[PDB]
Design a binder for this molecule. Structure first.
Ligand SMILES: Nc1nc2c(c(=O)[nH]1)N[C@H]1C(S)=C(S)[C@@H](COP(=O)(O)OP(=O)(O)OC[C@H]3O[C@@H](n4cnc5c(=O)[nH]c(N)nc54)[C@H](O)[C@@H]3O)O[C@H]1N2
Ligand SMILES: Nc1nc2c(c(=O)[nH]1)N[C@H]1C(S)=C(S)[C@@H](COP(=O)(O)OP(=O)(O)OC[C@H]3O[C@@H](n4cnc5c(=O)[nH]c(N)nc54)[C@H](O)[C@@H]3O)O[C@H]1N2
Ligand code: SF4
Ligand SMILES: [Mo+6]
Lengths: 982, 113
């Protein structure tokens, strides 16, 4: 008979996939029953059938996790690479901690900046920076935040900088928050699923099941708009090509089409958007530039990009929408230039295809039909990334799809916990809960709070950010405890104050000038992920010290090692001291991570890490305690802010996940009472809602939007009730979502002004005469139907913005601008303004930009379903699935170059080259653009010089070092290359 | 001598364990007039035992072992938050779940460990 079932007596552990943001549930199996004498060893992993999002499924990455956990390249011991050396030397943990602490203290004492030139205390350290792990837990994230800021660091970023930064920069100004608005299962309720600016079937496969459910079982139309015919296109009803970097033209064309054909949800637009608000008379746009442009500083004076004010100081309105200055009429005028012919001429999209897309999207302007957009990097990684997203968000507002089940903007997050690290503020000028570090111009607490607490711009609005002081003081109480009091302004001056944003491109420009001494790379592989790899390696080579914390060997940890063409360096010429510290992976700790739908999910430990590997919190603690002890006995610069930071854990060298998660949730530090004299919480208890946070020092929380995640009722992130009473796919009992378990953001907009559902078959909330109740937690207060209170409660005007006032760097309305490296060498809409006029481009990088005469083809980089960045190539199962590096080109380009399918080729740019196998296919076709034939060369990003897949080249060897004008997110999706037979 | 068991010829373990824990025979109040226990309920601490006939317990140091919160002797939480090997959630120890006797002496006169 068959072999016996191999898991019958194994230990079963629940955990979550460590790769993308879908957050699939896992059931891991270990050899051993937990007895102390048996050392657990995971030997099989499969899906959790009860998880509502994945329902047992796992894509090739999740399904192959065993080979990552047990990779031959797992790190085992602390290792050190000496200056000019070509080998690693194993050292003890104590040696690593002491050496690192000594290096850090010497650098901090030499370069710490206590006061700026204007005499303000700024307590900042800029000569050592850090990259944080979006693949690690929220608890690791908070410890990292405390570690970095208490030391005064401002060059602190996580993957968000090179990923969804543009989304936050655009969706927050448009809707009030930067997060994905709905959730995975909810996609099944859509009538139209739009995959543009993303490739969900390859980048979020298990989550994509719900788009297939919408298509197959809800009769939805699936549309894919991409320069390549992808695996998502394989199952699409409609496929339309588009040239990389032209989305704003295509989307603005859709806006023009909707307005011209009156295919909008008029009542939704009139009441829920700022369509009726009047704009200042001095606002204008002409020939590619908005009013207020300063050509020398290459920035805009945004004074004119604002509303006209009435006698009470609120925005003036014209409910009839006839006034020439209302947002609605100005929007109509702005997009009038984007005709179908213009779309075809710039995007290359045939008019017949564009028409099909317009018609289908237009069909969802009906109140009971919705479109949901699924996007990611195809839109974010451009110099106009934030504006790409602005245009789509505007479309969803015109169609009345925000706040609707089956609608919304599903900005699909990347790393398993990039959402959590963004929430916790591991970005240069951020603090947890979307709070902001003080700028150096804000000399006192009062000035700081006033700058961050917005005044309402229309009467009768929730304007919830008015509560900023309560969140800030509570954060300070969590950080400093008894040391933070009213008398010393809650420790205000201990936080580092910024003079500017220290984004990664800027910081590496500084590194190249010799201004950076050390760098930490915690679960981040910049040699593989940063743009212009040859320059990146050159920059890192100038560092005096580097500390890598990871569960795997990474290209960054071995940047000093010669790997032939893949990494042609001379170890003897690189003086950097490199420390490589072995950490745990997802399966070796308990903790929480936030998925794309804002679900904070708890997971449990399945085995101990291999060799001497330690968990991330232990590694930080080891370095931190060694460093603070040096300060205790030697003194030094910036002693007080460092020593005042709390590290209140039962075992200081081993902070536990539950301790940190509870800190994030928050506590009542004194008994708390409501206005009627009723006790809401007792001293020492966990808080149940951020509504209970106060600005008087009686409450603490290190992440206010997480209050409710772990209460006196227990760890809500561990909830496993998959009940869906409404049938809409909303499972309030599984895990816990922020804010306050609201699964669909902006849900008040799922109903009209009288509280009646736009679609009676999709009711999310309803009015019972005294409060809002329903199938989801209301993302609203208790304003009765008919009142002026808007549904976008984080907006000072309570509306979705069609006109983004003074929030965007390059304009209150999106506008087409070509990529820095463009195949046309001009912009057909306005030749006088070719690329984004507010883009920052350092002189050194401008010299490394190519032109179409030498690099005629559009280069773009993307993913394949089988691999996750340069991480999975360390796992055998995935290496077997896609073993060797390739690039994709059309049959037309291959024929012109004499390249046969499977032949070896050399793809190059102004910055470098890679060699690979050519995948010649009709899935890539040239487009007719502005009278030329434009070809695209596709470059997947999964291979490199470490791993078990066949050795290859870092794709970023080709990419330009320039980014979005708002977030400085690199333009990895549209540049120029050349190709030759190899 | 009482032998108050539902089946006199087969006393059950839970019946006797509850007798050992103890009961409030009348509603009990603290000095501030606050109800500490209702007539018929299991006592939560020997601190609530009285010398006036209103409380019963056949083993005072065992009061807290089986309360209105349930059989604490059946608790199976092996959590050790401090790392010192103290597991307050596994079973129940007398007196009042104190695992290390004389622990005030683990600190000096000023309360410092
Ligand atoms: N399989 C797998 N899954 C992943 C990851 C992985 O490494 N592998 N990484 C995770 C992370 S960190 C993230 S951020 C997501 C991102 O996931 P996505 O952004 O969906 O994925 P990408 O593969 O980067 O590419 C997006 C698509 O845009 C197309 N494209 C290129 N230029 C443009 C353009 O200018 N306009 C439009 N409209 N399309 C363009 C590309 O051909 C590509 O198919 O993936 C996550 N999921
Ligand atoms: N050409 C081009 N460039 C890109 C992109 C693109 O589309 N094209 N996309 C960009 C985006 S969106 C992203 S997110 C980046 C990602 O690029 P990176 O995040 O740098 O790359 P990864 O390979 O995902 O590796 C991160 C590390 O996390 C480690 N890790 C796993 N679990 C833990 C843990 O618990 N603790 C620690 N300390 N480490 C852990 C993994 O082993 C891995 O080495 O690439 C970006 N760069
Ligand atoms: S990579 Fe994403 S889609 Fe695949 S199993 Fe992991 S979480 Fe699910
Ligand atoms: Mo990403």
């Amino acid at each position: 008979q068959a072999r016996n079932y191999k898991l019958l007596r194994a230990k079963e552990i629940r955990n979550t996939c460590t790769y993308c943001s879908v957050g699939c549930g896992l059931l891991m199996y270990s050899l051993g029953d937990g007895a102390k004498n048996a050392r657990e060893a995971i030997y099989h992993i499969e899906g959790d059938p009860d998880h509502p999002v994945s329902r047992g499924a796992l894509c090739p990455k999740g399904a192959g996790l065993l080979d990552y956990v047990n990779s031959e390249n797992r790190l085992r011991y602390p290792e050190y690479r000496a200056p000019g050396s070509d080998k690693w030397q194993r050292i003890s943990w104590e040696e690593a901690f002491s050496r690192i602490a000594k290096l850090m203290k010497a650098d901090r004492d030499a370069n710490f900046i206590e006061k700026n030139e204007q005499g303000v205390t700024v307590n900042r350290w800029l000569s050592t920076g850090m990259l944080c792990a979006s693949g690690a837990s929220n608890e690791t994230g908070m410890l990292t935040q405390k570690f970095a800021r208490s030391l005064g660091m401002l060059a602190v970023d996580n993957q968000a900088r090179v990923x969804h930064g543009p989304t936050v920069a655009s969706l927050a100004p448009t809707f009030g928050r930067g997060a994905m608005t709905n959730h995975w299962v909810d996609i099944k309720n859509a009538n139209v699923v739009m995959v543009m600016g993303g490739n969900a079937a390859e980048a979020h496969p298990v989550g994509f099941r719900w788009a297939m459910e919408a298509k197959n079982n809800n009769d939805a139309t699936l549309i894919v708009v991409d320069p390549r015919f992808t695996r998502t296109a394989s199952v699409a009803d409609i496929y339309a090509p588009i040239r990389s970097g032209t989305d704003i033209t295509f989307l603005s064309g859709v806006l023009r089409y909707l307005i011209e054909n009156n295919k909008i949800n008029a009542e939704y637009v009139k009441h829920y958007t700022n369509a009726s608000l009047l704009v200042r008379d001095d606002f204008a746009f002409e020939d590619g530039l908005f009013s207020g442009y300063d050509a020398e500083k290459r920035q805009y004076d945004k004074s004119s990009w604002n509303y006209q004010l009435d006698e009470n100081g609120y925005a003036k309105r014209d409910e009839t929408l006839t006034h020439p200055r209302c947002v609605w009429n100005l929007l109509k005028e702005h997009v009038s230039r984007y005709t179908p012919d213009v779309v075809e001429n710039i995007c290359g999209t045939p008019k017949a295809d564009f028409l099909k897309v317009c018609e289908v999207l237009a069909s969802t302007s009906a109140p009971d039909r919705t479109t949901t957009f699924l996007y990611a990097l195809g839109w974010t990684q451009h110099t106009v990334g934030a504006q790409n997203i602005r245009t789509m968000a505007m479309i969803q507002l015109l169609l009345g799809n925000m706040g609707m089940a089956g609608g919304g903007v599903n900005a699909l997050r990347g790393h398993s916990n990039i959402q959590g690290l963004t929430d916790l503020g591991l970005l240069s000028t951020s603090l947890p809960g979307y709070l902001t570090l003080p700028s150096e111009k804000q000399v006192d607490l009062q000035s700081y709070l006033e700058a961050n607490t917005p005044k309402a711009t229309l009467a009768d609005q929730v304007n919830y950010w008015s509560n900023y002081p309560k969140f800030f003081v509570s954060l300070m109480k969590s950080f400093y405890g008894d040391a933070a009091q009213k008398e010393n302004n809650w420790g205000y001056d201990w936080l580092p104050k910024w003079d500017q944003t220290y984004d990664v491109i800027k910081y590496f420009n500084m590194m190249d000038e010799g201004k950076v001494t050390g760098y930490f790379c915690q679960g981040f592989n910049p040699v593989a992920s940063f743009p212009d790899k040859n320059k990146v390696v050159s920059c890192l080579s100038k560092l005096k010290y580097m500390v890598v914390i990871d569960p795997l060997v990474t290209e960054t940890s071995t940047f000093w090692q010669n790997h032939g063409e893949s990494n042609d360096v001379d170890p003897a010429s690189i003086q950097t001291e490199v420390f490589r510290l072995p950490s745990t992976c997802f399966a070796e700790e308990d903790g929480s991570i936030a998925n794309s739908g804002r679900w904070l999910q708890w997971h449990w430990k399945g085995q101990d890490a291999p060799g001497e590997a330690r968990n991330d919190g232990e590694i930080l603690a080891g370095i931190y305690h060694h460093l603070r002890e040096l300060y205790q006995s030697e003194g030094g610069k910036g002693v007080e802010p460092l020593m005042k930071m709390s590290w209140n854990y039962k075992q200081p060298h081993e902070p536990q996940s539950d301790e940190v998660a509870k800190e994030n949730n928050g506590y009542a530090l004194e008994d708390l009472y409501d206005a009627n004299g009723v006790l809401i919480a007792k001293k020492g208890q966990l808080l149940s809602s951020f509504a209970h946070l106060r600005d008087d020092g009686t409450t603490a929380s290190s992440c206010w939007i997480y209050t409710g995640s772990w209460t006196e009722q227990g760890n809500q992130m561990a909830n496993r009730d998959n009940s869906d009473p409404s049938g809409l796919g909303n499972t309030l009992g599984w895990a816990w979502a922020w804010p306050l378990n609201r699964r669909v953001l902006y849900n008040r907009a799922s109903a009209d002004i009288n509280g009646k559902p736009w679609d009676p078959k999709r009711m999310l909330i309803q009015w019972n005469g005294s409060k809002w109740t329903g199938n989801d937690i209301p993302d609203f207060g208790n304003a009765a139907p008919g009142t002026p209170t808007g549904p976008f409660i984080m907006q000072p005007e309570g509306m979705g913005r069609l006109f983004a006032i003074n929030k965007m760097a390059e304009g209150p309305f999106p506008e087409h601008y070509e990529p820095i490296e463009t195949p046309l060498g001009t912009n057909p809409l306005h030749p006088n303004v070719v690329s984004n006029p507010v883009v920052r481009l350092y002189e050194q990088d401008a010299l490394r930009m190519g032109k179409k005469e030498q690099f005629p083809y559009v280069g773009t980089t993307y993913r394949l379903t089988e691999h996750f960045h340069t991480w999975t190539k360390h796992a055998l199962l995935n290496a077997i699935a896609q073993p060797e590096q390739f690039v994709e080109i059309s049959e037309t380009l291959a024929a012109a170059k004499g390249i046969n399918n499977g032949d070896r080729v050399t793809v190059s740019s102004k910055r470098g080259f890679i060699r690979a196998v050519a995948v010649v296919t009709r899935r890539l076709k040239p487009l007719n653009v502005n009278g030329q034939q434009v070809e695209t060369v596709g470059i997947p990003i999964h291979w490199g010089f470490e791993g078990v897949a066949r050795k290859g080249y870092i794709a970023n060897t080709l990419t330009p070092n320039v980014g979005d004008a708002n977030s400085q997110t690199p333009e990895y999706k549209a540049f120029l290359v050349n190709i030759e037979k190899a």
